[PDB]
Each structure stands twice: as structure tokens, then as C-alpha cells.
Coordinates of C-alpha atoms in Angstrom, one line a residue:
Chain A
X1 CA 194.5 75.0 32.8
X2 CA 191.3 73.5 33.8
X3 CA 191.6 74.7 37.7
X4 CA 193.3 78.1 36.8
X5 CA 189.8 79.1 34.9
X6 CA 187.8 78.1 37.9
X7 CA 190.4 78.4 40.7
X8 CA 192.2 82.0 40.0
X9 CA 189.1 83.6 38.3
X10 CA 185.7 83.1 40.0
X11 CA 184.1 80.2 38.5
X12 CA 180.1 79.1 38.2
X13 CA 179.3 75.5 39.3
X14 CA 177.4 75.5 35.6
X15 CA 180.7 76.4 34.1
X16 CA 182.5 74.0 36.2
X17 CA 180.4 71.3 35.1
X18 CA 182.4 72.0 31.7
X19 CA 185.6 70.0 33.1
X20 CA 183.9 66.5 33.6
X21 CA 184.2 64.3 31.6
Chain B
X1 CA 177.6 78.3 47.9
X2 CA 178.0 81.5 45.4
X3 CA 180.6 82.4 42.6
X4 CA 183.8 81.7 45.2
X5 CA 187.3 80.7 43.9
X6 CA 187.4 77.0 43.1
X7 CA 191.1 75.4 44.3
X8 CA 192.6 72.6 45.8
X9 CA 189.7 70.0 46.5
X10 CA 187.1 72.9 46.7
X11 CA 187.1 72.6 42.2
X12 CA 187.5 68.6 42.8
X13 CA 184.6 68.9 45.3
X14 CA 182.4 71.3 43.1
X15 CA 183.6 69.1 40.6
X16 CA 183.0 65.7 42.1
X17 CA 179.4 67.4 43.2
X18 CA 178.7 69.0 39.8
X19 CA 179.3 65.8 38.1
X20 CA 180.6 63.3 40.6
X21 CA 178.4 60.7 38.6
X22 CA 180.2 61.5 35.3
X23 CA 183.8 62.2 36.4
X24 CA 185.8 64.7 35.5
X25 CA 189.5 65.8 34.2
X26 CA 191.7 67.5 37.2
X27 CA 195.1 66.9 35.8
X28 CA 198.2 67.6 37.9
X29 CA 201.9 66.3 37.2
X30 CA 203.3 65.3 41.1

């Protein structure tokens, strides 16, 4: 699930920074 | 760029852009 929170669901680029590594 | 979807490449590539520098962890069995 780490596309489904930002891919389905609108996602920040700040909250997207949350899947590096 | 605003609060769009992020799938396919587009997360990879706000991914890769976000971080890029630090990697990241798109999984995906294929």
C-alpha cells in the first residue's frame, strides 16, 4: 500500500516524501 | 504541480523528485 495512499487518495509531495527510504 | 493523484511513474516521479537523492520503496510483484 504505499501507492494506494498517494495514488487513489490525493497525496501531498510532503506526504509522499514519507515513502523514501 | 498541486494535490493531483499520484500513480504509475507520476508517485515514482514525485517520488524520485521528492527524494530522488535518498531513494525510495515502490514495491510491486510482476
Amino acid at each position: 500500500g504505499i501507492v494506494e495512499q498517494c495514488c487513489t487518495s490525493i497525496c501531498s509531495l510532503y506526504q509522499l516524501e514519507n515513502y523514501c527510504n | 504541480f498541486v494535490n493531483q493523484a499520484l500513480c504509475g511513474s507520476d508517485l515514482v516521479e514525485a517520488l524520485y523528485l521528492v527524494c530522488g537523492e535518498r531513494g525510495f520503496f515502490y514495491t510491486k510483484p510482476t
